């Protein structure tokens, strides 16, 4: 009777955890933010349009200097943009066209990419020979690679479609830690501002909080009805927002182990592809299959703006470190800077 | 360029040279014929690859026309999360094995194998990304089908079959059952080949079907139809 005994043990343990966290919800976040002054109506103009990709754009990432971009497209190209003068700094040709994610090193010396070849390729940008060369190829995932984030120049964490995440040592070239616990494909990563923890969002309608230096999950967050495609941290690292395929975004509290606010409307039927916050944490920007982005007042949960202008699905979206621009990429092969 | 420094002008012309290289590389890659090779477990696509981990790519050339063939069988993830990457291929090459009308599925002894392949065909044919990509259908192992049909009846797979228990009619029945899974009978088309052997029959059939697909695409995007 070990099987059903452990099954009912886990059932009652989850039930009492749920009851304990339900006896903690004093009042809804909408009840405490019921008197704050609303943001208003956020109106943005396309300052720059970045052209030169000849296929769908699947990923995009900002430099920490708040000026340079990296973008990955399915024409087998990884382009670095100036975004003040719309100049191309580098155009990197990939060995595999099926790139699904790209990342920019926080120092600026490296970019990484990955996709359907189950490999994370790390490129060296500042070489004395004057070209960009593949500095490392991390292999060991048995599924496609869905996200990758640099911790520093020598550490990267990667999500794959084999239901696991992995923290690597770029110098040695082999996994140092493996994070398991998801029952479906892992679709999104977000690093905490201090990179002591990260949050993962998977196809099992679940998110998890992993400690990097321990290799083991701290908390699990449920509440979505479909697959989670995007995830991002609140600017102080005490909350995070997910975007799933049921046309809802949600705000989860790390300390309370609960969700706070749902960002959904009756006129939206398509799933969210991207999620990002503003520098202060008041505006939540979400990219949609609707072909347009939406800006939500992240405290009262009412749409404070719309970013229309893309002819196809919005696949990627980001906000600069200084907080002065929003880059948006889409399946029509154009990026747009907004302000 | 007047309000630009010397170094800004040099950066601008470097960007322009990058643009030139990008256009040169992207016009060359628009002349490649991309084929998405699909199929079920032990369908027979290994022989098909022989005639002509992650994604497996196969470049070849036949009569001054370059073919890319992406075998995607090494991925056990959810197909709905990466299939849209293949929106825009010239055609989908689907391989079926005619010998599976009697074999039961490996994991499930109850569920049939031919019905599983038919389910996969109906899943990919009526998808929302492949509404207008033709499906070149190969029916492999036809020489192991006429041999196994002498002792085994096709009624095991299709209980509603009513006809002669010969190869020439049962093969037509199978082909019709696979072709009738199509819903958009006007938008897209299915090309069926009964493979098994010969010098250059399969490759030339793919060449014919691909040339026809290209002609129809040009007619559609160039006014007519």
């Amino acid at each position: 009777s070990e099987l059903d005994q452990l099954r009912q043990e886990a059932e009652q343990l989850k039930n009492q955890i749920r009851d304990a966290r339900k006896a903690c919800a004093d009042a809804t976040l909408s009840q405490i933010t019921n008197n704050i002054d609303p943001v208003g109506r956020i109106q943005m103009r396309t300052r720059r349009t970045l052209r030169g990709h000849l296929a769908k754009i699947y990923a995009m990432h900002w430099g920490t200097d708040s000026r340079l971009l990296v973008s990955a497209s399915q024409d087998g190209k990884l382009i670095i943009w100036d975004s003040y003068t719309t100049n191309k700094v580098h155009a990197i040709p990939l060995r595999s066209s099926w790139v699904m994610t790209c990342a920019y090193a926080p120092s600026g010396n490296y970019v990484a990419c990955g996709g359907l070849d189950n490999i994370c390729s790390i490129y060296n940008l500042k070489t004395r020979e004057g070209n960009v060369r593949v500095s490392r190829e991390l292999a060991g995932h048995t599924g496609y690679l869905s996200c990758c984030r640099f911790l520093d120049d020598n550490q990267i964490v990667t999500s794959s479609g084999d239901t696991t995440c992995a923290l690597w040592d770029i110098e040695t070239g082999q996994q140092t830690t493996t994070f398991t616990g998801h029952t479906g494909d892992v679709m999104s990563l977000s690093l905490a501002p201090d990179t002591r923890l990260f949050v993962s969002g998977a196809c099992d309608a679940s998110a998890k909080l992993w400690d990097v230096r321990e290799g083991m999950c701290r908390q699990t967050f449920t509440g979505h009805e479909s697959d989670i495609n995007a995830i991002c941290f609140f600017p102080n690292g005490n909350a995070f927002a997910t975007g799933s395929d049921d046309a809802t975004c949600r705000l989860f509290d790390l300390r309370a182990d609960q969700e706070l606010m749902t960002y959904s409307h009756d006129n939206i039927i398509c799933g969210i592809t991207s999620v990002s916050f503003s520098k202060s944490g008041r505006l939540l920007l979400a990219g949609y299959d609707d072909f347009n982005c939406n800006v939500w007042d992240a405290l009262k949960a009412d749409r404070a703006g719309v970013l229309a202008g893309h002819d196809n699905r919005v696949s990627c979206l980001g906000v600069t470190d200084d907080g002065m621009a929003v880059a948006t990429g889409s399946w029509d092969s154009f990026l747009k800077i907004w302000n | 360029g007047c309000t630009l420094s010397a170094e800004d002008k040099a950066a601008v012309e470097r960007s322009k040279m990058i643009d030139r290289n990008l256009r040169e590389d992207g016009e060359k890659a628009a002349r490649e014929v991309k084929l998405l090779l699909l199929g079920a477990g032990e369908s027979g696509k290994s022989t098909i690859v022989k005639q002509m981990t992650g994604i497996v790519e196969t470049h070849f050339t036949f009569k001054d026309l370059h073919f890319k063939m992406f075998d995607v069988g090494g991925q056990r993830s959810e197909r709905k999360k990466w299939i849209h990457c293949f929106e825009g291929v010239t055609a989908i090459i689907f391989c079926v094995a005619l010998s599976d009308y009697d074999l039961v599925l490996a994991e499930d002894e109850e569920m049939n194998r031919m019905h599983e392949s038919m389910k996969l065909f109906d899943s990919i044919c009526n998808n929302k990304w492949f509404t207008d990509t033709s499906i070149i259908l190969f029916l492999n192992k036809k020489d192991l089908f006429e041999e196994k049909i002498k002792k085994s009846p096709l009624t095991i797979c299709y209980p509603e079959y009513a006809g002669s228990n010969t190869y020439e009619e049962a093969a037509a029945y199978i082909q019709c059952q696979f072709e009738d899974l199509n819903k958009r009978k006007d938008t897209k088309e299915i090309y069926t080949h009964f493979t098994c052997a010969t010098d250059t029959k399969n490759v030339q059939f793919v060449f014919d079907a691909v040339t026809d697909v290209i002609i129809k695409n040009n007619l559609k995007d160039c006014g007519l139809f």
């Epitope: 000026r67 700094v89 020979e129 | 040099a10």
Partner: single-chain antibody, 230 residues
């Protein structure tokens, strides 16, 4: 990275000559090239420039009409065709690579040199010598005719160092950015029109001639040079 020049030697006056610089160890086709000469007992003097795709060529207006610059990219070679050589062209021609994108080092590697003997903004370095002792801070000053601080925030000042018998080396680019391979002892500063390079702890590998250059506009002009001897 290696650039080796050739084609020097004694030349009769009024004739012609051709210098070839062969590159090995870097992507030659993505680097602009400059020819920069130096009189036997004088400072550096920019001569010519050819861009990455050969689509932009400049000459100082003292060799214009007599000199031509070209690059063979498949063969990885740079040519200078000199015609009507006067007696004031006796120099040691160096070839220097230059890549311009956002954040690059445009004068990092200098060639080895070609000895040839024939039988705009003004950059001022007031002090022409510094009698200094090791272990103490050193300061050099450079003074520009006009402000180099462009409207985009970039001030285009370069600091090079030439040791006895060696090619010049990029110490600092854009007045504050320390070149890769340079110890943190060197430090550039200043603003707009007056600039200063400071060294904290002098060593025996720092004696030589220091040059300041502007890259605001062509022709690129070099400073007279301050000589640290110890």
């Amino acid at each position: 990275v290696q650039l080796v020049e050739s084609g020097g030697g004694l030349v009769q006056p009024g004739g012609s000559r051709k210098l070839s610089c062969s590159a090995s160890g870097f992507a030659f086709s993505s680097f602009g090239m400059h020819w920069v000469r130096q009189a036997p007992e004088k400072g550096l003097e920019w001569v010519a420039y050819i861009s990455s795709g050969s689509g932009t060529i400049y000459y100082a207006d003292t060799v214009k009409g007599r000199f031509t610059i070209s690059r063979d990219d498949p063969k990885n070679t740079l040519f200078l065709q000199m015609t009507s050589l006067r007696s004031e062209d006796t120099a040691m021609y160096y070839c220097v690579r230059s890549i311009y994108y956002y954040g690059s080092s445009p004068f990092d590697f200098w060639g080895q040199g070609t000895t040839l003997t024939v039988s705009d903004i003004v950059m001022t370095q007031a002090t022409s010598s510094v009698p200094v002792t090791p272990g103490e801070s050193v300061s050099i000053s450079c003074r520009s005719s006009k402000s180099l601080l462009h409207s985009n925030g970039n001030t285009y000042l370069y600091w090079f160092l030439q040791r006895p018998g060696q090619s010049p080396q990029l110490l600092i680019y854009r007045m504050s950015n320390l070149a890769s391979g340079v110890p943190d002892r060197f430090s550039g500063s200043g603003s707009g029109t007056a600039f200063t390079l400071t060294i904290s702890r002098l060593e025996a590998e720092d004696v030589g001639v220091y040059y300041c250059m502007q890259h605001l506009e062509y022709p690129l002009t070099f400073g007279a040079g301050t000589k640290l001897e110890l």
